[PDB]
Amino acid sequence: SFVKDFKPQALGDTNLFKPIKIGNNELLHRAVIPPLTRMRALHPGNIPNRDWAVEYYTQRAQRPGTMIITEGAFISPQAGGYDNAPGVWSEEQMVEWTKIFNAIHEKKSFVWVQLLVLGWAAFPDNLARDGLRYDSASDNVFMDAEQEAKAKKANNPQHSLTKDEIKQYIKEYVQAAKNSIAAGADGVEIHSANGYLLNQFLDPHSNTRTDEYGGSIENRARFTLEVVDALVEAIGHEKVGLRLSPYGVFNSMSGGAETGIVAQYAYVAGELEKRAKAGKRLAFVHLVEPRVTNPFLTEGEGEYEGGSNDFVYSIWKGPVIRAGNFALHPEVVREEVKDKRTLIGYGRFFISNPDLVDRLEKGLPLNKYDRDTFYQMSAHGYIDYPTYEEALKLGWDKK
Template identity: 35%
Template sequence: MTTSLFQPIQLGSLALKNRIVMPPMTRSRASQPGDVPNDMMAKYYGQRATAGLIVSEGTQISPMGKGYAWTPGIYSPQQIEGWKKVTSEVHAKGGVIFAQLWHVGRVTHPDNIGGEQPISSSAIKADNVKVFVDNGTTEPGFVDVTVPREMTKDEIDQVVAQFRQAALNAVEAGFDGIELHAANGYLVNQFIDSEANNRTDEYGGSLDNRLRFLDQVVATMVEAIGKERVGVRLAPLTTLNGTVDANPIETYIGAAELLNRHQIGYLHIAEVDWDDAPDTPVSFKRALRKAFQGVLIYAGRYNGEKGAQAIDDGLADMIGYGRPFVANPDLPARIQNNYPLAEHDPNTLFGGGEVGLIDYPAYQK
C-alpha cells in the first residue's frame, strides 16, 4: 500500500498535495550563450507538476560555480527571466517548485568556467572524476577534472554573498523556495568532508570548522528569504565526486543538528542509490530524525511501497524519486494506481533537445 505517500503535508506556509518529491536532476538543456532556462525546460517541469514538491536541477550561482556544459544559472537578468517561464508553468499546473542552488567547486574543468582554475576548500584534486564540456557537438564530451586552488577568506565571503543573491534571485524568478546543494561532492561538501579539506584556518580541521561554511551560507540565505523557504541536501554516506569523510555518522549528525538550529524548512538526504550499494543504517536514520525536527526527505532506491513504509516507520516525511521521473511525467498517478513504469533512455539524459526530455508520454490504459 502506498497510501502514506498521498497524504498532504505542510512545508512552512506551503500545503503540499502529496509526499512525492521530484529531486534535482541535471539535464543540461539551457539555451546558449548564457545558460538561460527556456520554454522546453518549462514544459518539462510543468509535465511533472503533480509531484508534491519539485526541486529544480542544480543551478549555478555564478559563472565559476558551473560544473558541466549547458547547465542553467541564476545570476543574470536573462536567467531570472528564463526561470520565470518555468515557475509560471509549474504554478499554472498546481505545483510547488524550489530552486536547487549549487557551486561545484573543484568538480569542473576550465573549459566550463571561462578558462579559470577551479576553486575549492583545498588544493586537492578529486580522484577519478570526470565532467562534460561543450566540445562543439550536441553530445557531452567527458574530460578529467583539474587541480583546484584553495579559496582565500575573501573568496569564501564572496561565494557566501553569491549564495545569498542567488536565493533572492530565485524568489524574484517565482520559486517557492530554494535547496542548497551541500551533497554529492560539490563545493559545500568539499568543506564538510574531512578528506577533501586540509585547511589549517577556521574552515578546516575540527568538525565545527568544517561545518562553518555550511553554517554561513545557510544563515545568509535564511536571513535573505526566510527559514521556511530554505532546504538543504546532504549525502552522508556517499563518496560521489571524490569527497570522503573519516567519520560520516558523526559529521552528518552534527550537520543535521546545525541545520535544525537554523530551523530550515527541510533536510533532503541523498542515499547511495547504485544497485549493489549498502543500505543506510536504520540507526543512523533514527539519529538524523532526532537531530532534525523539520521535514525530512529521503531519495534513493525507493519504489512506492518502500517510500510509504519509510513514512509509516517515522523515518521520513517525503520521498524523492529521481530517475523514475525522467520517463514517467505522471509518476504520482502511476504509483497510486500501480501502473507500470516506463524506462528512460540513458543516452538522452544530458544535452540535446526535446527527445528524452519532454517526449515521454503519460500512461494510457
C-alpha cells in the first residue's frame, strides 16, 4: 500500500533535479541511495545473493544517473561477524559484485561500495566459531550487556586493538578498495558512522585508549584519517568518500549528550578540507542527520533537536550527502537543496520504492515499507516492491 497520510510534493523544480559531478560520475539528479544492509548474502563465505542481488540493484538503478552506495561490505573475515552481510575480500564475492556493478552501469547509474568493519557490533559467537577476535577500540566498555555476556560465553572477550592490528585493518581496507575498483565500482565509501569500528574510535564513550589512538580529539580521529589517507593513496581521492553520524546514538555512540561531539567531528571535517586544499579532495562527505539518531526507530522518533550538521559546511567545502527522514519531508528537502552542493540520501523509502526518483520528481504517493522484511532471507520485501505504475495496476490508489 501507499503511505496513508503523506502529502507528496513534486521536487522537480528544485536542485534535487539538477545534475552534479561526484568523483568521476556525472549524476543527473541528487537523490542518492545510501548504504542499506539487507542481509541477503549467503553463508558460507558472505556471498552477495546469487539469486536476487542483481535484480535488487538493477531495480533501484532504473533512473538514469543515480548514485547508489551499496550495503556495507566487510573488508575481511575479521571485519565481519554477520553471516548474511556480504564481503569484498574473496574471488567468489567479487564474481557476484561484478554482476551487480555491470547491471547498475547498464542502467546508466553509478555504484560506490561502502567498506564496513563492525568492531563491537559484531556477533562474538560467529567470530569465535570462525577463530576470529571480537574487536573494538577498548576492552573495558561494551556495546551493551548482552554483547559483553555473549563474548564471554564464547570465550572471546572484547579485545582492544593493538597498533599492529589497526595497521592490518588498514591493509584490508586498501585491498578491499582495490578489489571494488577492479570489479568495476565507481568508488568506495569509508563507513565511519553508526557506531561501527571507526566510529568506536571517534567516540570518547567507546574509546578509552591512552595511546596515540585515543585520549584526545586528534588521537580519536587518527584511525579514520589513516584509512582515508591509505585509500586516497591507493585508488585516488576522486574515488573515496567518508560517512559520519555526529549525533548518532545507534550502537551505543554518544551523540549530543557528549559536549565534545561537535568538536570531534569538526576536527575530522577540517582535516578533510586541509587535504582538499592540498590537492586531494574527497569525492564527498556523507552525513547522517540528527533527524535520525537510530534508524531502527520509526520516522520522527529518536530525533535530536539540540544539534545541526550545518557546522560541517563552514569547514568542508565539497559535496555533502545528507540522510535521515527526508522522504516524508519534501518541505525540508526543498530548503536543504537550495545549497548547491547538497545531495539527499533516501534510505528506507528506497527499500520500498524502486522508482523513488520518479516519485520525488513528480510528487507521487510512496509505497509503505515493510520493516519485517528489511533483513529477512527473501525476495519478498526485497525485489517485489512495485513501481508506481505497477502499484496502480494492483489497485493501491484504492487501498
